[PDB]
Design a protein around this ligand. Sequence first.
Ligand SMILES: Nc1ncnc2ccccc12
Lengths: 19, 351
Amino acid sequence: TTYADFIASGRTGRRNAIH
Amino acid sequence: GHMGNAAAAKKGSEQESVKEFLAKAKEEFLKKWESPNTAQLDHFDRIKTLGTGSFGRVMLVKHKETGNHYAMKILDKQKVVKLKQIEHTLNEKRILQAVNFPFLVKLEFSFKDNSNLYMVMEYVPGGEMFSHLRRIGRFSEPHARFYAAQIVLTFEYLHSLDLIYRDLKPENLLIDQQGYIQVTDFGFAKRVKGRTWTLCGTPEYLAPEIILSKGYNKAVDWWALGVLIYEMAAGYPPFFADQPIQIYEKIVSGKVRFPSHFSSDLKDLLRNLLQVDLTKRFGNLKNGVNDIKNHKWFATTDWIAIYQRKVEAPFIPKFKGPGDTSNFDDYEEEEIRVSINEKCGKEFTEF
Ligand SMILES: Nc1ncnc2ccccc12
């Protein structure tokens, strides 16, 4: 599922701004 | 047409009243921007760390004389200098002192000492939207719309002041005691009447034209609103991948997929916000914000009532009294050491 793909991305936690 | 005479006259008058409000709001902002050490560290008891960044940390504090609780952002000056964020820090303080809006956090005190800069603002006790979204999974469309309408009004306000926000995401949105949104972080906000060019933001929320290294304008905030609405309603953002570079390829592709449970009205709004083509993106057209506020997905939204905070929130966070921090995660507690030698004094003279 798309949700499973989201989990698989590993970016499910708090995201930093780019630097 | 779509509106009869009564609805059309009501809408037109409402839009005119918004103009009159924003004109007065701009005048008040500029007066405060033109003419802004209002406390000291031993005026507060430090209670608990509420959040952390590369700058330092945000702590719950109690103002000793008054007993009131506040959130105190502590920035290590040497860290700020090393991170090349001098201008961001001074600009954030300058914005927070000057703006006034029910969904923008109120700064109460600011001061500095040999080592740190301090911003004391209202304590927003209901936690990050991010935690609530990940815990609940996704928000219903009415729940997402309640939040979205607050961002629309907040961006309508900031853009009338020529401020681009540039870092919208659930992580930057706090929930107050009445279930309404508070925006606190302005580290990437900038006064931009025309265009600007800095690569900044968070990968999932970057507009294509930022990724593509173009000169861009306030329409990047309306793209970020599309990402936010999508993430609130889906529980995940429209563009994700293992690494930022792959997220960027998806963003610029012009393609977006929607969960089957998204309403048609929602998908239509999102296709118009997540529009790569600037000549077609809602929020960037001749009709301005009105294309968004008058969209079918917002038809049930009473914009004045949202502004007045008279809508019953779909979610009221757990509030066990003042100074309660149960809606916030635990962070490792460092120590606020203050050097006997002044650091970076010249760089932060205006703070
Ligand atoms: N104003 C704040 N209230 C509560 N928690 C926070 C966390 C980060 C920044 C500001 C605040």
